[PDB]
Design a protein around this ligand. Sequence first.
Ligand SMILES: *[C@@H]1O[C@H](CO)[C@@H](O[C@@H]2O[C@H](CO)[C@@H](OC3O[C@H](CO)[C@@H](O)[C@H](O)[C@@H]3O)[C@H](O)[C@H]2NC(C)=O)[C@H](O)[C@H]1NC(C)=O
Ligand SMILES: *[C@@H]1O[C@H](CO)[C@@H](O[C@@H]2O[C@H](CO)[C@@H](OC3O[C@H](CO)[C@@H](O)[C@H](O)[C@@H]3O)[C@H](O)[C@H]2NC(C)=O)[C@H](O)[C@H]1NC(C)=O
Ligand SMILES: *[C@@H]1O[C@H](CO)[C@@H](O[C@@H]2O[C@H](CO)[C@@H](OC3O[C@H](CO)[C@@H](O)[C@H](O)[C@@H]3O)[C@H](O)[C@H]2NC(C)=O)[C@H](O)[C@H]1NC(C)=O
Ligand SMILES: *[C@@H]1O[C@H](CO)[C@@H](O[C@@H]2O[C@H](CO)[C@@H](O)[C@H](O)[C@H]2NC(C)=O)[C@H](O)[C@H]1NC(C)=O
Ligand SMILES: *[C@@H]1O[C@H](CO)[C@@H](O[C@@H]2O[C@H](CO)[C@@H](O)[C@H](O)[C@H]2NC(C)=O)[C@H](O)[C@H]1NC(C)=O
Ligand SMILES: *[C@@H]1O[C@H](CO)[C@@H](O[C@@H]2O[C@H](CO)[C@@H](O)[C@H](O)[C@H]2NC(C)=O)[C@H](O)[C@H]1NC(C)=O
Ligand SMILES: *[C@@H]1O[C@H](CO)[C@@H](O[C@@H]2O[C@H](CO)[C@@H](O)[C@H](O)[C@H]2NC(C)=O)[C@H](O)[C@H]1NC(C)=O
Ligand SMILES: *[C@@H]1O[C@H](CO)[C@@H](O[C@@H]2O[C@H](CO)[C@@H](O)[C@H](O)[C@H]2NC(C)=O)[C@H](O)[C@H]1NC(C)=O
Ligand SMILES: *[C@@H]1O[C@H](CO)[C@@H](O[C@@H]2O[C@H](CO)[C@@H](O)[C@H](O)[C@H]2NC(C)=O)[C@H](O)[C@H]1NC(C)=O
Ligand SMILES: *[C@@H]1O[C@H](CO)[C@@H](O[C@@H]2O[C@H](CO)[C@@H](O)[C@H](O)[C@H]2NC(C)=O)[C@H](O)[C@H]1NC(C)=O
Ligand SMILES: *[C@@H]1O[C@H](CO)[C@@H](O[C@@H]2O[C@H](CO)[C@@H](O)[C@H](O)[C@H]2NC(C)=O)[C@H](O)[C@H]1NC(C)=O
Ligand SMILES: *[C@@H]1O[C@H](CO)[C@@H](O[C@@H]2O[C@H](CO)[C@@H](O)[C@H](O)[C@H]2NC(C)=O)[C@H](O)[C@H]1NC(C)=O
Ligand code: NAG
Ligand code: NAG
Ligand code: NAG
Lengths: 320, 320, 320, 174, 174, 174
Amino acid sequence: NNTATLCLGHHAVANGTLVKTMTDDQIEVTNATELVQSISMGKICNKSYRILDGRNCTLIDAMLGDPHCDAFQYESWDLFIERSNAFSNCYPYDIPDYASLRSIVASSGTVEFTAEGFTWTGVTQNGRSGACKRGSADSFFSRLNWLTKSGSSYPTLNVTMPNNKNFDKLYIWGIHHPSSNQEQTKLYIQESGRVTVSTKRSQQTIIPNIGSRPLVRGQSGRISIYWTIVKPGDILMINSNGNLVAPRGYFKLNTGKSSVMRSDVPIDICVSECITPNGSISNDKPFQNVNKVTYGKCPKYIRQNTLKLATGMRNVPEKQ
Amino acid sequence: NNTATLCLGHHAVANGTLVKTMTDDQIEVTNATELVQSISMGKICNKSYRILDGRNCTLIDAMLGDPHCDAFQYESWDLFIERSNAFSNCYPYDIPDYASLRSIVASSGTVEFTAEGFTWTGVTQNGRSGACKRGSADSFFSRLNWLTKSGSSYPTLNVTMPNNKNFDKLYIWGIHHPSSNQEQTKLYIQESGRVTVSTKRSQQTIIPNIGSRPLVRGQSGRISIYWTIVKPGDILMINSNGNLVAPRGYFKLNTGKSSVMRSDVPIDICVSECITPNGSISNDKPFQNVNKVTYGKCPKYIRQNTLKLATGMRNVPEKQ
Amino acid sequence: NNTATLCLGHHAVANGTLVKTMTDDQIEVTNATELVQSISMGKICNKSYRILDGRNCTLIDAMLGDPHCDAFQYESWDLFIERSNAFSNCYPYDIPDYASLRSIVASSGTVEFTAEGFTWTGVTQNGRSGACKRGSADSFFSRLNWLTKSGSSYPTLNVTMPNNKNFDKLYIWGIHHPSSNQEQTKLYIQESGRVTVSTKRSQQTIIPNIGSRPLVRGQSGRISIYWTIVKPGDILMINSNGNLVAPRGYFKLNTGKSSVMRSDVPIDICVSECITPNGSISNDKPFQNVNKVTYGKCPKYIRQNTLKLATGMRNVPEKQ
Amino acid sequence: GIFGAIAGFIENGWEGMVDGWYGFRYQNSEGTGQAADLKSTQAAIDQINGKLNRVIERTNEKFHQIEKEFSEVEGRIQDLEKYVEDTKIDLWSYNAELLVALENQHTIDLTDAEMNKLFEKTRRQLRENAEDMGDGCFKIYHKCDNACIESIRTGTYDHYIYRDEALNNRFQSG
Amino acid sequence: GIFGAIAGFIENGWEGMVDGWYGFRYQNSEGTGQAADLKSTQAAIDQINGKLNRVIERTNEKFHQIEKEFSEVEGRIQDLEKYVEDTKIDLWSYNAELLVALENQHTIDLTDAEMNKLFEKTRRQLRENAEDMGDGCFKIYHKCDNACIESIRTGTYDHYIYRDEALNNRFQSG
Amino acid sequence: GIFGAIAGFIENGWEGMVDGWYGFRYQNSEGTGQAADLKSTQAAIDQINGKLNRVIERTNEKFHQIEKEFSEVEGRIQDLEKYVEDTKIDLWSYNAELLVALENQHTIDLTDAEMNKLFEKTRRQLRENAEDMGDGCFKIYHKCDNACIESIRTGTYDHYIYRDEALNNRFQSG
Ligand SMILES: *[C@@H]1O[C@H](CO)[C@@H](O[C@@H]2O[C@H](CO)[C@@H](OC3O[C@H](CO)[C@@H](O)[C@H](O)[C@@H]3O)[C@H](O)[C@H]2NC(C)=O)[C@H](O)[C@H]1NC(C)=O
Ligand SMILES: *[C@@H]1O[C@H](CO)[C@@H](O[C@@H]2O[C@H](CO)[C@@H](OC3O[C@H](CO)[C@@H](O)[C@H](O)[C@@H]3O)[C@H](O)[C@H]2NC(C)=O)[C@H](O)[C@H]1NC(C)=O
Ligand SMILES: *[C@@H]1O[C@H](CO)[C@@H](O[C@@H]2O[C@H](CO)[C@@H](OC3O[C@H](CO)[C@@H](O)[C@H](O)[C@@H]3O)[C@H](O)[C@H]2NC(C)=O)[C@H](O)[C@H]1NC(C)=O
Ligand SMILES: *[C@@H]1O[C@H](CO)[C@@H](O[C@@H]2O[C@H](CO)[C@@H](O)[C@H](O)[C@H]2NC(C)=O)[C@H](O)[C@H]1NC(C)=O
Ligand SMILES: *[C@@H]1O[C@H](CO)[C@@H](O[C@@H]2O[C@H](CO)[C@@H](O)[C@H](O)[C@H]2NC(C)=O)[C@H](O)[C@H]1NC(C)=O
Ligand SMILES: *[C@@H]1O[C@H](CO)[C@@H](O[C@@H]2O[C@H](CO)[C@@H](O)[C@H](O)[C@H]2NC(C)=O)[C@H](O)[C@H]1NC(C)=O
Ligand SMILES: *[C@@H]1O[C@H](CO)[C@@H](O[C@@H]2O[C@H](CO)[C@@H](O)[C@H](O)[C@H]2NC(C)=O)[C@H](O)[C@H]1NC(C)=O
Ligand SMILES: *[C@@H]1O[C@H](CO)[C@@H](O[C@@H]2O[C@H](CO)[C@@H](O)[C@H](O)[C@H]2NC(C)=O)[C@H](O)[C@H]1NC(C)=O
Ligand SMILES: *[C@@H]1O[C@H](CO)[C@@H](O[C@@H]2O[C@H](CO)[C@@H](O)[C@H](O)[C@H]2NC(C)=O)[C@H](O)[C@H]1NC(C)=O
Ligand SMILES: *[C@@H]1O[C@H](CO)[C@@H](O[C@@H]2O[C@H](CO)[C@@H](O)[C@H](O)[C@H]2NC(C)=O)[C@H](O)[C@H]1NC(C)=O
Ligand SMILES: *[C@@H]1O[C@H](CO)[C@@H](O[C@@H]2O[C@H](CO)[C@@H](O)[C@H](O)[C@H]2NC(C)=O)[C@H](O)[C@H]1NC(C)=O
Ligand SMILES: *[C@@H]1O[C@H](CO)[C@@H](O[C@@H]2O[C@H](CO)[C@@H](O)[C@H](O)[C@H]2NC(C)=O)[C@H](O)[C@H]1NC(C)=O
Ligand SMILES: *[C@@H]1O[C@H](CO)[C@@H](O)[C@H](O)[C@H]1NC(C)=O
Ligand SMILES: *[C@@H]1O[C@H](CO)[C@@H](O)[C@H](O)[C@H]1NC(C)=O
Ligand SMILES: *[C@@H]1O[C@H](CO)[C@@H](O)[C@H](O)[C@H]1NC(C)=O
């Protein structure tokens, strides 16, 4: 009539949301959004990154060139996947600091092996083995060269290889630990051998140990693997009285954005920018409770499984 | 009469408190609470955790079984305390990576030693020493087995032990470094000995060094200790031309919430949930300035010695 | 006339500043201040800290006493600068864990070498070399003592030195790796030598390796350097069948606030309290984008190159 | 919140308000009405989206790093690697906790503020022609049809023309 | 704080107020009086306890870790272990500093807010029957005995029954 | 900000105000005028300097640490050293980001608050002698020369002596 009334107010929903404040553990607001990524895609997205399935092979065995890991000869990757059921089928071995060498390959992100024309006169090359078959016949590692006696002598080898390339060359070599006195002599003449590898900058001399170990695929002998880097300008050199497993060339070291991960989930035709052992995960949220192990453009991992950030006002429905 | 006055106001105290804000370094409020735990209980609470006093013994000597550390034969702990005045009384020794082995015991949280029935034919067992007395008579480490010549021979030992248990077995062994040429021969026949220990997965061959060191409790010879893990399915193996100090069995590795700490304070009959070298400390406050070394459910350590969080309003007393 | 009007307001500038809030990426305020230190002084301020220019020398070569690094005999520092073009001119070498020893010197912050009166009877001292010249004549490292045969014998040396000082003595020693069989014998009589160094607490036996390496300043032989600490009360001891490069005394270990850094910028007569490889930087701002490598009282390094903290109100100029 | 408007002197919210987040209901010569206020609604929403944008979609590429889980028992190195990762996680976990806590406290207050702003703004338009009823409503002391009200929502209300009328009704017995 | 109430237009606090944190003093036909306001006091306290609960008693079990102090000089590993621990401590030390800073600034404002709330709330009850004296007091322009005042503190004050009287006294020479 | 004063009901700022950060302009019997308010200006500035002091010039001595860049390829140790440093930097980088974000949001609101404070303060002095025009100006309903105005800026304005006059002009046709 001759007055009016004007009431101010705000909206409210029926099914609201709880959130944390500085003063409240659970206070109700109209809306909120989840900042924690809890669930994973399920499987590994082939995109956007160059993924590589390890299957029956570990990275080290692909580097080495274990016959059943010859598929990965010419292969590079952004991320290399190692499966739990993978294994070795070649001559039994062990590496001092396996990890470091694994890491150094994975980071470079390739197994492409540039061969070099090494010469070793007075010694027979290409040693075979009944516990490392390529096809049906006895073979060895594709990228390592087992040197043994020629005729009735194993002469002290002194061989070099200058790195005149524009980059660090990675070299991979080893040494044979025989099972008995009689294998040592009957294969390398001398009763105790040595392997000194060195450059202008460094050295590493190894001496092997005779005596039988447990059988691993029918071998009580062992082959310990070592490596060496060579900076542009520097020269490689090998000295061997006996028991050397020589190299066939080098791997080239690239400063890579590559790596390796241990996962068991199938790879599939989805897409994502970040990868964990549980599978690929969605990128958009700032945090994650899937797995502290991750690769790529990828959320931060945190202990909590849900952190709701309020995206609306305090919800105050009519009181009964 | 025909008006009234109604004044709004807030309380205030006489003896207030200073606190920090974003804009003030020292501003006065009615009340505040301390978030930094500065002082300690004084001593170590036997509860709630299973505490163990090291006294005259270090953890390694209890593992090893130094005669004066035979009290800890059957002992496990949540936290093991090492005292500064503790020492060794057995044969002088040194370990490559003492820490790692200390840590690996402490984490497992026990010294209980399951014996195994090893055999070593052609060699006399249980070597004694004048610098490791159990009772009055010459003894050795309880859990290590000094092997020496039998008659006029020390035959190349080749001994195995399969781990068919449901867990990783930890094995502890060593090697004798003699003082002179004549102790080497007059105790192990051969002039230079070897100790290869190995499994399907790994190896570790040691060779000893003859020549006198400084006397430690009247011994210029040394005994270097090594260890080995064995995963279920795998097999242990020892090969020794000479100078081996054999094992008597294994320690069982549990995935424990145990650890070790260096403290000098007395243990007592109080209670707490967190422990430092200065003593147990109160749990309730979120921070602490006692010591960065701690165990259990325990506040965070921070550089500052007091951080008062205001628990009341700004205190504004009447102005003069 | 018979009313008035009173308008409240705030100031505003013409050329304002943008800043980030919780709700805005770029919002305009009257004023702001920069919290990130982006640019560097340009060069290294000799003050306030004791700076030392490495020039042609690395820290290790000054420790060792490479003839061309004799300038640094009596020198200590707060911060020691290593130049990229520096080098070695003495006998070619390599250290197991170069870094650790570098770090251990740098932290102690001095090269002052206390000599000790060692005796070695039956062996000639002060071995010279054509690839380590002091002046024009053939010299060696000033602080290492190359021992060789005297007459027709190299007797097994057994030499001690008790640390009765009030501190840990740091000792530096090495071993000769010959180029051929005939240098070994024609310089140390025996065909295979040994170097055991030990104390009450520890040991370290080295055995050298014969065989030629690449030439480094005309030497296919090598000299590997090792070190040893000795705690007050303990005794030093050396045992050498052959190939030992003996020590001339010790370095004293101080618990220092010293360090070492790799920089190429000139040192100059400015002043600052913090130092990076790019030069000294201004202290006053809490953050920095210059370099994660720093020394002294020095801002925190962060990824962002500018973070403006608003120091005035929201700037609201008159609208057109 | 800190303004005592939402969850305060405004007793409760309106589930029927779907046009926006803030607005008016009224009662005049022409019946009853409801309407939203865009300016204020959009002022609130613009901020929350500010927040979101800051927090969401700001991820960093990380490639080869360390191992964070091991099978073999090693000791001093694995210990260090675990503790190191352990620390990272804890530190970040705290940041994420405190973050939402801060933001949300702010979001609440932020939205409360905007409720008080639209109130005072409105109050200021009415000048002497109305009285705060204390429930978030003004009694307007003059006939104010839908066009009049509109004017208020528009910001174009001219008080000088109702003043005499309003003042009349505001001040007598009767 | 930001509301200018505490340490502001309320000149100072009352040491005599022990019933609570906020309240009234008055002067009427029946003498002088003081009284607390529970609602507001409890509204403030509930929040601070919110804060406390969040920060206090939220500790985590941690067991075997690394060593953080050493006797032997080692080099590249001990360096790494020290620096690593060193870093943790510094990072956490900053969190604890900033925490109290944030909280306290908030606690102050929070308490200031509640002072302004009870004021406006009260103001709104009185409607046209009183005037803000600007010192945190209202001159009420009508006889208001203890029951009347009570009504105000209760929230049950009906202005329509004093309005004529109050308006009278508010507006004349005399 | 949250008070709706700056960048709100105060339409814009005054580039001509150089005496300070806050103040008055007016229009009276004696002409037009501008003047600053020190109390309020200095209240704002004192706080920002509080902030600065806290953040600026609080550096810590750090000496020998780890290496953070390497030439030789090593593996498990260098990896750990890089990742460890990498982590520190990221964690600190986040702190610095959030810091300025927090502070600035606060600085804005802080300055907005002070604008509202001086307003309400002034309002409260005028009591019944003036009306909020809603643009940050009061129409004062009585002759108020420069001394009168001064009194307001001084805080010494006595309303009881103009009240009758003001009330007169506030309430009639004419
Ligand atoms: C040192 O000692 C160990 C054990 O004492 C010896 O290992 C034995 O080696 C056997 C072959 O030489 C091998 O026995 C066999 O039995 C299984 C049956 O399923 C089959 O795989 C083959 O028939 C295989 O030959 C075992 O590995 C082991 N024997 C037993 C009974 O465990 C090792 O040869 C010794 N080495 C020396 C003396 O140099
Ligand atoms: C190599 O050289 C060192 C020192 O040059 C020899 O150490 C000596 O060993 C002594 C026993 O052989 C021992 O001397 C003794 O004196 C103290 C007196 O309090 C007592 O504890 C005993 O009587 C003890 O026998 C010392 O440890 C030391 N001598 C001195 C004078 O410091 C070591 O035996 C040599 N080893 C060889 C040649 O194999
Ligand atoms: C083992 O093999 C390597 C290479 O096969 C030998 O290195 C040679 O050593 C030469 C000196 O003995 C040296 O040749 C020289 O040529 C350059 C010309 O600019 C000059 O610096 C000198 O004339 C120098 O003598 C080279 O370093 C290298 N020769 C070549 C052709 O690369 C090494 O001596 C062998 N060591 C043995 C058998 O013990
Ligand atoms: C309430 O929050 C939900 C999600 O927490 C919002 O739902 C989405 O809206 C955003 C807005 O851009 C979209 O990007 C997403 O596609 C939606 N996600 C989901 C899971 O639904 C919703 O917008 C909010 N409600 C509002 C604003 O009314
Ligand atoms: C990889 O190796 C597996 C495991 O040996 C091969 O598996 C074959 O098929 C069954 C079931 O998977 C296994 O039980 C047998 O061990 C294998 N068959 C035979 C006849 O030996 C598998 O074929 C291999 N795949 C690739 C791609 O290399
Ligand atoms: C994601 O998968 C990981 C493995 O990559 C899970 O981690 C394991 O799961 C068990 C729970 O059954 C936990 O005890 C350990 O954390 C892990 N154990 C082993 C032996 O690896 C993890 O739980 C999964 N998490 C999510 C969210 O899917
Ligand atoms: C002022 O603060 C002090 C401590 O800083 C408070 O004292 C305690 O009150 C709490 C409340 O639950 C109790 O848990 C503790 O047992 C008390 N501790 C100590 C050391 O006295 C006190 O409550 C506060 N004063 C108030 C609220 O009036
Ligand atoms: C642990 O060893 C200590 C130190 O040797 C023993 O101390 C005995 O008593 C006094 C004073 O404590 C020492 O000075 C002597 O060295 C020791 N006495 C004798 C006769 O040798 C202590 O008895 C030992 N305690 C335990 C529980 O093993
Ligand atoms: C708690 O005890 C620790 C030892 O566990 C103290 O640390 C030592 O104390 C001195 C001060 O006298 C400091 O220089 C060093 O931090 C420590 N030195 C050595 C040799 O250990 C610590 O000061 C004590 N702190 C408190 C709060 O009780
Ligand atoms: C606006 O900010 C600038 C710098 O960001 C201020 O300039 C300085 O003022 C401070 C005040 O103590 C001095 O310490 C510095 O010497 C000045 N630095 C530079 C680079 O000019 C300026 O004061 C601010 N303007 C004001 C407050 O009006
Ligand atoms: C440090 O060594 C340098 C590099 O050898 C010396 O440089 C001399 O001068 C020129 C130009 O710098 C170089 O090309 C030559 O190699 C050096 N000259 C000669 C005659 O050999 C420099 O003199 C040395 N300086 C110090 C202080 O030791
Ligand atoms: C400061 O100097 C450092 C070197 O101490 C610079 O770091 C190098 O610069 C390049 C850019 O040209 C970057 O790719 C790398 O970070 C560094 N490379 C090498 C080989 O060291 C750094 O860029 C400089 N930064 C500033 C702000 O001056
Ligand atoms: C809200 O949720 C309840 C229970 O889940 C459901 O029955 C109802 O239909 C929903 N109603 C709304 C959003 O109005
Ligand atoms: C406050 O403290 C002073 C000095 O410590 C003391 O003398 C006085 O009795 C106390 N008075 C209070 C809390 O009223
Ligand atoms: C502001 O900056 C502009 C462009 O840089 C310049 O031309 C002008 O003179 C400045 N004027 C001011 C601060 O009033």
